[PDB]
A paper describes a structure:
To investigate the interaction of the GlcNAc6P substrate with the protein, we mutated Asp-267, which has been shown to be important for catalysis in other [name] enzymes, to alanine. This resulted in significant loss of enzymatic activity and enabled co-crystallization of the MSNagA enzyme in the presence of GlcNAc6P. The structure was solved by molecular replacement using the apo-MSNagA as a model and refined at a resolution of 2.0 Å. The co-crystal structure shows clear electron density for GlcNAc6P in the substrate-binding pocket of Chain A, enabling the substrate to be modeled in the active-site pocket at the dimeric interface. However, it may be that the site is not fully occupied, and no electron density for the GlcNAc6P substrate was observed in the second active site of chain B where instead a flexible loop region from Glu-122 to Pro-136 partially occludes the active site. The GlcNAc6P substrate is situated in the cavity of the (α/β) barrel of domain I at the dimer interface, recruiting Arg-219 from the opposing monomer through an interaction with the phosphate moiety. The GlcNAc6P substrate is found in the α-configuration and is anchored in place through the formation of hydrogen bonds with the side chains of His-244 that interacts with the anomeric GlcNAc6P hydroxyl group and with Asn-212 to the phosphate group. The carbonyl group of the GlcNAc6P substrate is positioned ∼2.5 Å from the M1 metal ion, which is ideally primed to stabilize the transition state intermediate formed during catalysis. We therefore modeled a cadmium ion at this position, which is likely to arise as a result of the addition of CdCl2 in the crystallization conditions with the metal-binding site perhaps being destabilized by the [name] mutation. The M2 metal ion is similarly coordinated to Glu-122, His-188, and His-209, and it is striking that an additional interaction is formed with the carbonyl group of the GlcNAc6P substrate, replacing the water molecule in the apo-structure.
Author numbering:
A (entry chain A): -2 to 378
B (entry chain B): -2 to 382
Write the structure that this text describes.
Amino acid sequence: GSHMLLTADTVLTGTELLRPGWLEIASDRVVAVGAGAPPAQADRNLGAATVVPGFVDTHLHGGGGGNFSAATDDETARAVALHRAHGSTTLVASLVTAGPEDLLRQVSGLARQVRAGLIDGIHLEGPWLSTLRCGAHQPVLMRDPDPGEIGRVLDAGEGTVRMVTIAPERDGALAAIAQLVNAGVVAAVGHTEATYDQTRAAIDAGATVGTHLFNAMRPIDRREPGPAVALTEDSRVTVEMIVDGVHVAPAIYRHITQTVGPERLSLITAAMAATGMSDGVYRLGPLDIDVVAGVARVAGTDTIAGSTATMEQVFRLAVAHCGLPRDDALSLAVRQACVNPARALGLPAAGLAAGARADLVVLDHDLAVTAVMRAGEWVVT
Amino acid sequence: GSHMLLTADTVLTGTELLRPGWLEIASDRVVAVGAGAPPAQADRNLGAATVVPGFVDTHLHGGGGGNFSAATDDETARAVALHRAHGSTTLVASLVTAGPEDLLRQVSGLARQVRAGLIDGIHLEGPWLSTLRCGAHQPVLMRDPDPGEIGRVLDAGEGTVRMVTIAPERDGALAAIAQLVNAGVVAAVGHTEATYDQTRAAIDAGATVGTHLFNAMRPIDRREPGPAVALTEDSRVTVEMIVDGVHVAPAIYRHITQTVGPERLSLITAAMAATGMSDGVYRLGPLDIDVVAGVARVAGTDTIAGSTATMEQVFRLAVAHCGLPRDDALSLAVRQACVNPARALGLPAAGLAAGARADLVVLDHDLAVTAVMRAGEWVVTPGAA
Ligand SMILES: CC(=O)N[C@@H]1[C@@H](O)[C@H](O)[C@@H](COP(=O)(O)O)O[C@@H]1O
Ligand SMILES: [Cl-]
Ligand SMILES: [Cl-]
Ligand SMILES: [Zn+2]
Ligand SMILES: [Zn+2]
């Protein structure tokens, strides 16, 4: 654009709650943001709306019928369009376990769409995972992390692979974590039967993210705490959680938030390709997924295979279920849905502040998305 | 009575860490506490020792060969003498699940020792329980909480029953919790297969304590969190934890401390009658117990017969495993072993402060007890441990 001055009764910047607030947008940047009456006459008076920074979804597999694992322009476009429509202005595309050949093709294909700007990075969830915690993955393809293949895969992405999930109990997992962190890649722990001690070792080797805490993860036990306690204990780790109301009980979300504090939890969707569509049978990598009432299940089991949630939905549920008063709930959920995930992944600092890119979301009273701006242009006007 | 002046390199009062510190004792009361040099020449300089308030053990079954469930002067005296020598200056004696007539006799007999001053209260850990997990005491006598029997048992205690463990899923549990709170008794949640929702209902009905969190309790599951999460979530609840290194992993104790904060965890021993006994085989109530390297087992079996922890041991393990630097660790451990449990049970607020009873413990640099004072007199005088 050129000159936009927005007002709204509430503006959350990432670190403060402005009531009322205003933002001045020039081209694709925020030039200025503040509380009270605006420094000039406003162009857009949003009224009784809440403005938050754009949502930063760092772990999702598709949407609107599109699968990121397809690594085609059409499927990526329809996934990006749906999530962007719901306020996810930054997206890390996740790949499920795959054979070496398909992995290179998928990484190369997605890396092109990063460079094109459709997605902001690649997450490799697999193949270096535990077969005991596979879920919606093909366990046959999981393998020990080999430093030759890791280098080949990172070479193919040309710096666009941002995060790799590792099962810390596989042979060569601790070397692979060091190898990833030397390449500037975030090492995440997930899909693992690791003990407390093995997860603690992975953290000391440089893992800094917990992949959807409590899902595909050994449970907490009084004598063997398991990975979830190692991950919540260490302040260097940002834990992911899927708060769609299906993957973990809301009281678990509340418990972990209590434990790790406001800066150490990231909300994610793990959205699959049926997000935004109708019910039926779908595809995730090389698997068939039956979505019944929006609940994704691997065809023929009881295993939930991913969510059908957008960041707008998990934001709303975080606010409702975090147990804090409304204003504090909004502030917390903005840290979890915008600030913490961008920080954890080395992404452009989320936040509405002078010089930041103008990515923001307008929420109505019920906290539904009414507008979405990305790079200073309305995606949803 | 005259004023005794004590000095030590470090005095923890329950809220402050004084370095150096001093305390003035008159009769059985603390007169004054302060930092720096004493007001006069001290009657005893404890030197390079750390003084803490007396330990408050709110859940234990015996020690030194005595079972509180015996409800005799001889068994209670032996248990009290053992734990007192390791710094527990306040004790709440626990009874396991028992038959209705045996329950009344045990309560009646322990109430007399409350009135005599050997113990400070009674905890009924049973019979209104409902778990078969390891830790179950006598599950064939577990039964629904009948308000008639509760009134009869509370009457028998003449106000000395301070805590009652309730499994929240039994018919009548929520009513029993309301009945206990109205009678001024603490309702604890424990020995239960209750869901998260059923436990949160018990908390809304007035339960304020979790009986040895994670032990004898449904575990945490991602879709059914179980009672431990309801108990850690609610600020009204003080959770018990047995930190002897065996009942819960040290990192679980850190996790829970990190979750609930410094005010909401109590260290307990759940000590059984073999606590503090030398290696050997012993007749303790209805069981032959074999003690090997301080671990008690029923003779002829590999099965561990419960905790043999003293408050001295759990305090030292709490300081070692809480993951804080030493001074912050001592300050947390004093809250968990002294202030939080006394407050949860409505006991005389622990702490070395003007007006408080003179109950304190002297520890060396290894955090071993070297002296114990209770009501202004040395139970264990410095050097005699
Ligand atoms: C793509 C993928 O792997 N998604 C996982 C799924 O595998 C797992 O079954 C589910 C719950 O796992 P849980 O039953 O251990 O919580 O979480 C995620 O949806
Ligand atoms: Cl997932
Ligand atoms: Cl016990
Ligand atoms: Zn995933
Ligand atoms: Zn007990």
